Enzyme design. Structure first.
Site, PDB file in Angstrom:
ATOM      1  CE1 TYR A 188      -1.575  10.993  -4.220  1.00 50.65           C
ATOM      2  CE2 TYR A 188       0.491   9.914  -3.699  1.00 50.65           C
ATOM      3  CZ  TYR A 188      -0.288  11.054  -3.718  1.00 50.65           C
ATOM      4  OH  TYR A 188       0.217  12.238  -3.260  1.00 50.65           O
ATOM      5  CB  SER A 189      -2.837   2.350  -5.835  1.00 50.83           C
ATOM      6  OG  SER A 189      -1.586   1.680  -5.826  1.00 50.83           O
ATOM      7  CD  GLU A 190      -4.957  -1.375   0.426  1.00 50.15           C
ATOM      8  OE1 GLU A 190      -6.018  -2.026   0.296  1.00 50.15           O
ATOM      9  OE2 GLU A 190      -4.282  -1.372   1.478  1.00 50.15           O
ATOM     10  CB  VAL A 191      -0.543  -3.210  -5.936  1.00 50.90           C
ATOM     11  CG1 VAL A 191      -0.155  -4.278  -6.944  1.00 50.90           C
ATOM     12  CG2 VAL A 191      -0.587  -1.833  -6.597  1.00 50.90           C
ATOM     13  NE  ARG A 243      -3.338   0.663   3.058  1.00 47.69           N
ATOM     14  CZ  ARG A 243      -3.812   0.491   4.283  1.00 47.69           C
ATOM     15  NH1 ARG A 243      -3.336   1.208   5.293  1.00 47.69           N
ATOM     16  NH2 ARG A 243      -4.762  -0.404   4.512  1.00 47.69           N
ATOM     17  N   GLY A 244       0.563   2.105  -0.942  1.00 46.93           N
ATOM     18  CA  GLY A 244       1.161   3.419  -1.065  1.00 46.93           C
ATOM     19  C   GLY A 244       0.058   4.418  -0.809  1.00 46.93           C
ATOM     20  CG  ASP A 281       7.006   7.972  -9.433  1.00 42.22           C
ATOM     21  OD1 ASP A 281       8.036   8.364  -8.851  1.00 42.22           O
ATOM     22  OD2 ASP A 281       6.079   7.374  -8.874  1.00 42.22           O
TER      23      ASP A 281
HETATM   24  N1  LIG Z   1       2.786  -5.969 -13.087  1.00 41.37           N
HETATM   25  C1  LIG Z   1       3.297  -6.113 -11.868  1.00 41.37           C
HETATM   26  N2  LIG Z   1       3.922  -7.272 -11.560  1.00 41.37           N
HETATM   27  C2  LIG Z   1       4.434  -7.415 -10.332  1.00 41.37           C
HETATM   28  N3  LIG Z   1       4.426  -6.562  -9.313  1.00 41.37           N
HETATM   29  C3  LIG Z   1       3.800  -5.422  -9.646  1.00 41.37           C
HETATM   30  C4  LIG Z   1       3.226  -5.127 -10.865  1.00 41.37           C
HETATM   31  N4  LIG Z   1       2.670  -3.857 -10.842  1.00 41.37           N
HETATM   32  C5  LIG Z   1       2.913  -3.418  -9.634  1.00 41.37           C
HETATM   33  N5  LIG Z   1       3.598  -4.316  -8.856  1.00 41.37           N
HETATM   34  C6  LIG Z   1       4.023  -4.137  -7.474  1.00 41.37           C
HETATM   35  O1  LIG Z   1       3.108  -3.293  -6.813  1.00 41.37           O
HETATM   36  C7  LIG Z   1       3.757  -2.042  -6.476  1.00 41.37           C
HETATM   37  C8  LIG Z   1       2.803  -0.887  -6.658  1.00 41.37           C
HETATM   38  O2  LIG Z   1       2.410  -0.815  -8.048  1.00 41.37           O
HETATM   39  P1  LIG Z   1       2.428   0.634  -8.720  1.00 41.37           P
HETATM   40  O3  LIG Z   1       1.745   0.577 -10.043  1.00 41.37           O
HETATM   41  O4  LIG Z   1       3.823   1.139  -8.656  1.00 41.37           O
HETATM   42  O5  LIG Z   1       1.540   1.448  -7.663  1.00 41.37           O
HETATM   43  P2  LIG Z   1       1.647   2.915  -7.002  1.00 41.37           P
HETATM   44  O6  LIG Z   1       1.292   3.907  -8.065  1.00 41.37           O
HETATM   45  O7  LIG Z   1       0.669   2.928  -5.858  1.00 41.37           O
HETATM   46  O8  LIG Z   1       3.065   3.028  -6.542  1.00 41.37           O
HETATM   47  C9  LIG Z   1       5.023  -2.025  -7.337  1.00 41.37           C
HETATM   48  O9  LIG Z   1       6.019  -1.152  -6.821  1.00 41.37           O
HETATM   49  C10 LIG Z   1       5.404  -3.506  -7.316  1.00 41.37           C
HETATM   50  O10 LIG Z   1       6.003  -3.868  -6.092  1.00 41.37           O
HETATM   51  N1  LIG Z   2       3.384   8.917  -6.798  1.00 46.15           N
HETATM   52  C1  LIG Z   2       2.306   9.671  -7.010  1.00 46.15           C
HETATM   53  N2  LIG Z   2       1.247   9.113  -7.639  1.00 46.15           N
HETATM   54  C2  LIG Z   2       0.145   9.847  -7.825  1.00 46.15           C
HETATM   55  N3  LIG Z   2      -0.098  11.104  -7.438  1.00 46.15           N
HETATM   56  C3  LIG Z   2       0.969  11.633  -6.818  1.00 46.15           C
HETATM   57  C4  LIG Z   2       2.190  11.018  -6.598  1.00 46.15           C
HETATM   58  N4  LIG Z   2       3.079  11.892  -5.988  1.00 46.15           N
HETATM   59  C5  LIG Z   2       2.375  12.987  -5.824  1.00 46.15           C
HETATM   60  N5  LIG Z   2       1.085  12.896  -6.285  1.00 46.15           N
HETATM   61  C6  LIG Z   2      -0.001  13.875  -6.169  1.00 46.15           C
HETATM   62  O1  LIG Z   2      -0.299  14.377  -7.457  1.00 46.15           O
HETATM   63  C7  LIG Z   2       0.119  15.759  -7.567  1.00 46.15           C
HETATM   64  C8  LIG Z   2       0.892  15.932  -8.847  1.00 46.15           C
HETATM   65  O2  LIG Z   2       0.008  15.499  -9.904  1.00 46.15           O
HETATM   66  P1  LIG Z   2      -0.324  16.403 -11.153  1.00 46.15           P
HETATM   67  O3  LIG Z   2      -1.507  15.820 -11.895  1.00 46.15           O
HETATM   68  O4  LIG Z   2       0.882  16.406 -11.995  1.00 46.15           O
HETATM   69  O5  LIG Z   2      -0.643  17.907 -10.727  1.00 46.15           O
HETATM   70  P2  LIG Z   2      -1.904  18.868 -10.876  1.00 46.15           P
HETATM   71  O6  LIG Z   2      -3.085  18.112 -10.371  1.00 46.15           O
HETATM   72  O7  LIG Z   2      -1.581  20.179 -10.107  1.00 46.15           O
HETATM   73  O8  LIG Z   2      -2.011  19.225 -12.365  1.00 46.15           O
HETATM   74  C9  LIG Z   2       0.883  16.073  -6.282  1.00 46.15           C
HETATM   75  O9  LIG Z   2       0.703  17.427  -5.885  1.00 46.15           O
HETATM   76  C10 LIG Z   2       0.261  15.096  -5.278  1.00 46.15           C
HETATM   77  O10 LIG Z   2      -0.980  15.588  -4.779  1.00 46.15           O
HETATM   78 MG   LIG Z   3       2.422   5.642  -8.868  1.00 45.84          MG
HETATM   79 MG   LIG Z   4       4.908   2.860  -7.782  1.00 40.82          MG
END
Ligand SMILES: Nc1ncnc2c1ncn2[C@@H]1O[C@H](COP(=O)(O)OP(=O)(O)O)[C@@H](O)[C@H]1O
Ligand SMILES: Nc1ncnc2c1ncn2[C@@H]1O[C@H](COP(=O)(O)OP(=O)(O)O)[C@@H](O)[C@H]1O
Ligand SMILES: [Mg+2]
Ligand SMILES: [Mg+2]
Length: 326
Positions: free
Chosen positions: A49-52, A46-47, A155
């Site tokens: 912005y999402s749960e994977v 879990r980050g 990113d």
């Molecule tokens: N296609 C995939 N295969 C395996 N692991 C994955 C895959 N997509 C995501 N993951 C795992 O899940 C985590 C979160 O996915 P990600 O798309 O990076 O989400 P977030 O935008 O919340 O960071 C990755 O950092 C990785 O550990």
């Molecule tokens: N890893 C991330 N994944 C998704 N959203 C993120 C991430 N890191 C930061 N953010 C959020 O998204 C914003 C940046 O997204 P963006 O769409 O480019 O900006 P805006 O909505 O001002 O046009 C940050 O201010 C924060 O709220």
């Molecule tokens: Mg991301």
């Molecule tokens: Mg990621």
């Protein structure tokens, strides 16, 4: 009056020539699939912005990954979906296999092809000189593709690069922060992840482009070849610029902010100090000397530049002597 504009030196006008529907992601209509076709196995993490979740597609016994987005804003969900569909089938781009509505958090869920990744903390300590070069070239295929398609990943970092080492398969995942490049557009600087943030973000320069991803890639290369994770280990976003200036020097930083007419946060006056650019040989030691070569250092030198316009593009990077051995 204010900062000087900037534009990408490559793929500058890709989006203007394409139909509105390509880049105007807000108008995109999602073709929802059946959530109950994927059985959740376990939470991968879990980050903010999402749960994977690791999941099984029960119609074909294939392992998949299900990304369930945290609420956020409708605009962002359509952006990640649109970018993923526009790039689908591109070199080393993760494939979006399906889209479903999650019953628990009524927010949409992205289904992807599963990649047998290994935690980078363990995987990167086992990569050889040849392996770093091979995987760097594979990431460059993805970046040149997405940039050629008018998209900045925004990113680039190890957790966003899946590597199934046993099969030498690399996929660039996580297009959640990815955005369409439009010349002259002022973008949000709160993108990428701290250690991989370009100096343009750190100095609050909004008119950045694809070249941000090249700085991020450079940070990854420096950490891999010097065996220093992360390479620029800032305590916060301000100390992050300080760590960079201790390696790249302060004179080139001041010339960069002079060139783009940037108003540097006065908070930096007491912490930047005075630093000269270090020769890359300073970071070479007996335990990383096998990953370093004159080609590796020259390539790193050409990515890690304050001036975003002076960094190698992904195509130029693919031409570099560092890859002649691959
Ligand atoms: N296609 C995939 N295969 C395996 N692991 C994955 C895959 N997509 C995501 N993951 C795992 O899940 C985590 C979160 O996915 P990600 O798309 O990076 O989400 P977030 O935008 O919340 O960071 C990755 O950092 C990785 O550990
Ligand atoms: N890893 C991330 N994944 C998704 N959203 C993120 C991430 N890191 C930061 N953010 C959020 O998204 C914003 C940046 O997204 P963006 O769409 O480019 O900006 P805006 O909505 O001002 O046009 C940050 O201010 C924060 O709220
Ligand atoms: Mg991301
Ligand atoms: Mg990621």
């Amino acid at each position: 009056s204010g900062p000087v504009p900037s534009r990408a030196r490559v793929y500058t006008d890709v989006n203007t020539h394409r139909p509105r529907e390509y880049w105007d992601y807000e108008s995109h209509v999602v073709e929802w699939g059946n959530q109950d076709d994927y059985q959740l196995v376990r939470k991968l993490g879990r980050g903010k912005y999402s749960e994977v979740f690791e999941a099984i597609n029960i119609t074909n016994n294939e392992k998949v990954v299900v990304k369930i987005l945290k609420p956020v804003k409708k605009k962002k969900i359509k952006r990640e979906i649109k970018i993923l569909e526009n790039l689908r089938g591109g070199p080393n781009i993760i494939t979006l296999a399906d889209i479903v509505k999650d019953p628990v958090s009524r927010t949409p869920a992205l289904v992807f092809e599963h990649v047998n990744n290994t935690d980078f903390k363990q995987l990167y300590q086992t990569l050889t000189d040849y392996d770093i070069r091979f995987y760097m070239y594979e990431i460059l295929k993805a970046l040149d593709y997405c940039h050629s398609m008018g998209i900045m990943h925004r990113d680039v970092k190890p957790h966003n690069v899946m590597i199934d080492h046993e099969h030498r398969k690399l996929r660039l995942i996580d297009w959640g922060l990815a955005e369409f490049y439009h010349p002259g557009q002022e973008y949000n600087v709160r993108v990428a992840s701290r250690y991989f943030k370009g100096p343009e973000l750190l100095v609050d320069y909004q008119m950045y482009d694809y070249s941000l991803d090249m700085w991020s890639l450079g940070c990854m290369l420096a950490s891999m070849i010097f065996r220093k994770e992360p390479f620029f280990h800032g305590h916060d976003n301000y100390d992050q610029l300080v760590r960079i200036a201790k390696v790249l020097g302060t004179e080139d930083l001041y010339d960069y902010i002079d060139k783009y007419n940037i108003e540097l946060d006065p908070r930096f006056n007491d912490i930047l100090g005075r630093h000269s650019r270090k020769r890359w040989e300073r970071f070479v030691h007996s335990e990383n000397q096998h990953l370093v070569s004159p080609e590796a250092l020259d390539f790193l030198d050409k990515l890690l530049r304050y001036d975003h316009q002076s960094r190698l593009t992904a195509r130029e990077a693919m031409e570099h002597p560092y890859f002649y051995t691959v």
